[PDB]
Design a protein around this motif. Sequence first.
Motif, PDB file in Angstrom:
ATOM      1  N   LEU A 154       0.826  -0.986  -0.213  1.00  0.00           N
ATOM      2  CA  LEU A 154      -0.106   0.096   0.152  1.00  0.00           C
ATOM      3  C   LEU A 154       0.670   1.193   0.058  1.00  0.00           C
ATOM      4  CD1 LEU A 154      -2.829  -1.077   2.605  1.00  0.00           C
ATOM      5  CD2 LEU A 154      -2.958  -0.915  -0.027  1.00  0.00           C
ATOM      6  N   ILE A 155       0.591   2.046  -0.948  1.00  0.00           N
ATOM      7  CA  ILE A 155       1.393   3.420  -1.202  1.00  0.00           C
ATOM      8  C   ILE A 155       0.451   4.565  -1.210  1.00  0.00           C
ATOM      9  CG2 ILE A 155       3.040   4.384  -2.716  1.00  0.00           C
ATOM     10  CD1 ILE A 155       3.925   1.628  -1.700  1.00  0.00           C
ATOM     11  N   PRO A 156       0.745   5.490  -0.432  1.00  0.00           N
ATOM     12  CA  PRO A 156       0.112   6.611  -0.418  1.00  0.00           C
ATOM     13  C   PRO A 156       0.108   7.612  -1.320  1.00  0.00           C
ATOM     14  CG  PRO A 156       1.795   7.090   1.085  1.00  0.00           C
ATOM     15  CD  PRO A 156       2.006   5.710   0.669  1.00  0.00           C
ATOM     16  N   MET A 157      -0.900   8.167  -1.805  1.00  0.00           N
ATOM     17  CA  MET A 157      -0.587   8.993  -3.089  1.00  0.00           C
ATOM     18  C   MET A 157      -0.660  10.626  -2.849  1.00  0.00           C
ATOM     19  SD  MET A 157      -3.275   7.113  -5.677  1.00  0.00           S
ATOM     20  CE  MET A 157      -2.632   7.866  -7.137  1.00  0.00           C
ATOM     21  N   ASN A 158      -0.835  10.926  -1.490  1.00  0.00           N
ATOM     22  CA  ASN A 158      -0.815  12.389  -1.072  1.00  0.00           C
ATOM     23  C   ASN A 158       0.015  12.363   0.154  1.00  0.00           C
ATOM     24  OD1 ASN A 158      -1.615  14.908  -0.021  1.00  0.00           O
ATOM     25  ND2 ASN A 158      -3.059  14.971  -1.502  1.00  0.00           N
ATOM     26  N   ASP A 159       1.241  13.294   0.320  1.00  0.00           N
ATOM     27  CA  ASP A 159       1.873  13.198   1.429  1.00  0.00           C
ATOM     28  C   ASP A 159       1.384  13.813   2.518  1.00  0.00           C
ATOM     29  OD1 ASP A 159       4.641  15.474   0.293  1.00  0.00           O
ATOM     30  OD2 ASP A 159       2.613  15.954   0.709  1.00  0.00           O
ATOM     31  N   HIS A 160       0.186  14.574   2.338  1.00  0.00           N
ATOM     32  CA  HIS A 160      -0.399  15.208   3.450  1.00  0.00           C
ATOM     33  C   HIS A 160      -1.263  14.191   4.433  1.00  0.00           C
ATOM     34  CE1 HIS A 160       0.179  18.705   0.895  1.00  0.00           C
ATOM     35  NE2 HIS A 160      -0.985  19.466   1.431  1.00  0.00           N
ATOM     36  N   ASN A 161      -1.311  12.973   3.886  1.00  0.00           N
ATOM     37  CA  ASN A 161      -1.752  11.979   4.510  1.00  0.00           C
ATOM     38  C   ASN A 161      -0.582  11.472   5.649  1.00  0.00           C
ATOM     39  OD1 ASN A 161      -3.300   9.729   5.409  1.00  0.00           O
ATOM     40  ND2 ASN A 161      -3.109   8.592   3.582  1.00  0.00           N
ATOM     41  N   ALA A 162      -0.913  11.919   6.883  1.00  0.00           N
ATOM     42  CA  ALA A 162       0.097  11.623   7.873  1.00  0.00           C
ATOM     43  C   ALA A 162       0.505  10.136   8.403  1.00  0.00           C
ATOM     44  CB  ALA A 162      -0.038  12.517   9.057  1.00  0.00           C
ATOM     45  N   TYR A 163       1.755   9.991   8.220  1.00  0.00           N
ATOM     46  CA  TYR A 163       2.298   8.468   8.815  1.00  0.00           C
ATOM     47  C   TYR A 163       2.633   8.643  10.318  1.00  0.00           C
ATOM     48  CZ  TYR A 163       1.417   5.504   4.817  1.00  0.00           C
ATOM     49  OH  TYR A 163       0.624   4.717   3.657  1.00  0.00           O
ATOM     50  N   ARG A 164       1.805   9.153  11.304  1.00  0.00           N
ATOM     51  CA  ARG A 164       2.117   9.424  12.563  1.00  0.00           C
ATOM     52  C   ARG A 164       0.754   9.324  13.293  1.00  0.00           C
ATOM     53  NH1 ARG A 164      -0.765  14.202  14.414  1.00  0.00           N
ATOM     54  NH2 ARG A 164      -0.312  15.716  12.918  1.00  0.00           N
ATOM     55  N   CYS A 165       0.834   9.401  14.554  1.00  0.00           N
ATOM     56  CA  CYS A 165      -0.389   9.198  15.414  1.00  0.00           C
ATOM     57  C   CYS A 165      -1.299  10.383  15.681  1.00  0.00           C
ATOM     58  CB  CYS A 165       0.142   8.258  16.936  1.00  0.00           C
ATOM     59  SG  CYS A 165       0.757   6.734  16.502  1.00  0.00           S
ATOM     60  N   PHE A 166      -2.348  10.135  16.464  1.00  0.00           N
ATOM     61  CA  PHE A 166      -3.386  11.211  16.675  1.00  0.00           C
ATOM     62  C   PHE A 166      -3.994  10.810  18.193  1.00  0.00           C
ATOM     63  CE2 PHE A 166      -3.744  13.452  12.554  1.00  0.00           C
ATOM     64  CZ  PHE A 166      -2.935  12.812  11.719  1.00  0.00           C
ATOM     65  N   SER A 167      -4.866  11.739  18.474  1.00  0.00           N
ATOM     66  CA  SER A 167      -5.456  11.606  19.908  1.00  0.00           C
ATOM     67  C   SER A 167      -6.254  10.259  19.739  1.00  0.00           C
ATOM     68  CB  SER A 167      -6.368  12.892  20.180  1.00  0.00           C
ATOM     69  OG  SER A 167      -7.280  12.889  19.448  1.00  0.00           O
ATOM     70  N   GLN A 168      -6.638   9.821  18.754  1.00  0.00           N
ATOM     71  CA  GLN A 168      -7.627   8.489  18.643  1.00  0.00           C
ATOM     72  C   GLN A 168      -6.815   7.727  17.423  1.00  0.00           C
ATOM     73  OE1 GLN A 168     -10.330   7.545  20.200  1.00  0.00           O
ATOM     74  NE2 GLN A 168      -9.980   9.205  21.661  1.00  0.00           N
ATOM     75  N   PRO A 169      -7.082   6.473  17.401  1.00  0.00           N
ATOM     76  CA  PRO A 169      -6.379   5.551  16.671  1.00  0.00           C
ATOM     77  C   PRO A 169      -6.833   6.252  15.294  1.00  0.00           C
ATOM     78  CG  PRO A 169      -7.514   4.321  18.132  1.00  0.00           C
ATOM     79  CD  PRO A 169      -8.040   5.734  18.343  1.00  0.00           C
ATOM     80  N   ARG A 170      -5.834   6.144  14.215  1.00  0.00           N
ATOM     81  CA  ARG A 170      -5.803   6.683  13.019  1.00  0.00           C
ATOM     82  C   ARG A 170      -5.833   5.605  12.009  1.00  0.00           C
ATOM     83  NH1 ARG A 170      -6.683  12.055  10.917  1.00  0.00           N
ATOM     84  NH2 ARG A 170      -5.217  12.462   9.130  1.00  0.00           N
ATOM     85  N   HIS A 171      -6.795   5.775  10.863  1.00  0.00           N
ATOM     86  CA  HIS A 171      -7.060   4.837   9.795  1.00  0.00           C
ATOM     87  C   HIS A 171      -6.446   5.614   8.711  1.00  0.00           C
ATOM     88  CE1 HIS A 171      -9.398   2.155   6.684  1.00  0.00           C
ATOM     89  NE2 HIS A 171      -8.326   1.823   6.986  1.00  0.00           N
ATOM     90  N   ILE A 172      -5.360   5.070   7.988  1.00  0.00           N
ATOM     91  CA  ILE A 172      -4.574   5.791   7.001  1.00  0.00           C
ATOM     92  C   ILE A 172      -4.895   5.633   5.625  1.00  0.00           C
ATOM     93  CG2 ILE A 172      -2.169   6.244   6.137  1.00  0.00           C
ATOM     94  CD1 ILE A 172      -1.257   6.030   9.231  1.00  0.00           C
ATOM     95  N   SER A 173      -4.930   4.285   5.124  1.00  0.00           N
ATOM     96  CA  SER A 173      -5.399   3.882   3.988  1.00  0.00           C
ATOM     97  C   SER A 173      -6.918   3.883   3.610  1.00  0.00           C
ATOM     98  CB  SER A 173      -4.549   2.533   3.730  1.00  0.00           C
ATOM     99  OG  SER A 173      -5.351   1.457   4.541  1.00  0.00           O
ATOM    100  N   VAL A 174      -7.326   5.185   3.638  1.00  0.00           N
ATOM    101  CA  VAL A 174      -8.911   5.327   3.635  1.00  0.00           C
ATOM    102  C   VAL A 174      -9.463   4.971   2.137  1.00  0.00           C
ATOM    103  CG1 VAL A 174      -8.838   6.695   5.689  1.00  0.00           C
ATOM    104  CG2 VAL A 174      -9.129   7.730   3.658  1.00  0.00           C
ATOM    105  N   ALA A 175      -8.734   5.512   1.213  1.00  0.00           N
ATOM    106  CA  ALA A 175      -9.313   5.530  -0.134  1.00  0.00           C
ATOM    107  C   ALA A 175      -8.579   4.775  -1.205  1.00  0.00           C
ATOM    108  CB  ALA A 175      -9.725   6.905  -0.526  1.00  0.00           C
ATOM    109  N   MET A 176      -8.556   3.487  -1.339  1.00  0.00           N
ATOM    110  CA  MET A 176      -7.936   2.716  -1.871  1.00  0.00           C
ATOM    111  C   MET A 176      -8.337   2.310  -3.164  1.00  0.00           C
ATOM    112  SD  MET A 176      -6.717  -0.215   1.036  1.00  0.00           S
ATOM    113  CE  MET A 176      -6.602  -1.356  -0.259  1.00  0.00           C
ATOM    114  N   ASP A 177      -7.644   2.498  -4.302  1.00  0.00           N
ATOM    115  CA  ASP A 177      -8.035   2.218  -5.580  1.00  0.00           C
ATOM    116  C   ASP A 177      -8.829   0.923  -5.693  1.00  0.00           C
ATOM    117  OD1 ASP A 177      -5.705   0.455  -5.559  1.00  0.00           O
ATOM    118  OD2 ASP A 177      -4.660   1.200  -7.264  1.00  0.00           O
TER     119      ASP A 177
END
Length: 273
Positions: free
Chosen positions: A126-149
């Motif tokens: 899985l490769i992100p297409m936008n570097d604004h998609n942060a690969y770090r943590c938040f105050s709540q669990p973070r789902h990163i790969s939300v819109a996969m082709d």
Amino acid sequence: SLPACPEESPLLVGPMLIEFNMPVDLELVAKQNPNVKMGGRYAPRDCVSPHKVAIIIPFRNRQEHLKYWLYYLHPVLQRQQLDYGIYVINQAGDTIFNRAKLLNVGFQEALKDYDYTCFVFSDVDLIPMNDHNAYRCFSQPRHISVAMDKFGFSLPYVQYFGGVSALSKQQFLTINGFPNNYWGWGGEDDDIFNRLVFRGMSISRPNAVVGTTRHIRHSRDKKNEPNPQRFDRIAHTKETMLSDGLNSLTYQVLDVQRYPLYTQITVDIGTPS
Ligand SMILES: CC(=O)N[C@H]1[C@H](O[C@H]2[C@H](O)[C@H](O)[C@@H](O[C@@H]3[C@H](O)[C@H](O)O[C@H](CO)[C@H]3O)O[C@@H]2CO)O[C@H](CO)[C@@H](O)[C@@H]1O
Ligand SMILES: NCCCCCCOP(=O)(O)OP(=O)(O)OC[C@H]1O[C@@H](n2ccc(=O)[nH]c2=O)[C@H](O)[C@@H]1O
Ligand SMILES: [Mn+2]
């Protein structure tokens, strides 16, 4: 003496062009990423990042995919100004695959290297297409790969939490980590979603555009056949998470290799008990 990095990185370029039709040479990738130190470690030299991230990739016989992953992610992670490390958790042997158990191994072993306080769990393809998609943590669990082709650039279902996610050290500990008994494909990500909900958390997500992600099309791997017991297991998470996870984990590391772009932990996680 170094000041804190800015809250949001000023280095981001946003939308990127992602392709998997060309050969990748890791020695060259290493040359293109001169600031990544042995073992796939990096921290900005001009400021202190509050994000100490261990990126954990469950793995077996996916070297080609891993090369693309490293080629695309390393530049992105550095632009996000993260203090990070890459860990490929290689399952020893040729028996049924166990994605979630390897992820627990990654969490425990990475902590032996450095005081990481954030964990990104990512499939190798899985490769992100936008570097604004942060690969770090938040105050709540973070789902990163939300819109996969492969899912038509949207979530397959609203409670889907697979692919790529980030949990802080505390979030992970709070749910007793991930289940150790989901052998074979399916359900372990749904079990994890349940764990988070049963511990009072909710899923944080970037918008669908920023979260656009590409999946490297591939055929079925052998030894990771759909788990027929998955539907029954996700129905009892609330009870089973109490005693199945970090607090019931054992494994034997067979080898640790520090490659220029990543650390590979080859581990024997056994078979079903
Ligand atoms: C428990 C499990 O298998 N979870 C995986 C998730 O499964 C989806 C499946 O992708 C699809 O959305 C639908 O599939 C039905 C399911 O297999 C049922 O038992 O039988 C019918 C027969 O027509 C299927 O259509 O619902 C499943 C359960 O939510 O898919 C995601 C993405 O691949 C996996 O990450 C997750 O582990
Ligand atoms: N038509 C072909 C559809 C292929 C269906 C196979 C299911 O595919 P996915 O749901 O993407 O799951 P997967 O990629 O096989 O497994 C997820 C993750 O486990 C890891 N993984 C799984 C199996 C294996 O042999 N090796 C490995 O490294 C890898 O990080 C991978 O990205
Ligand atoms: Mn895949």
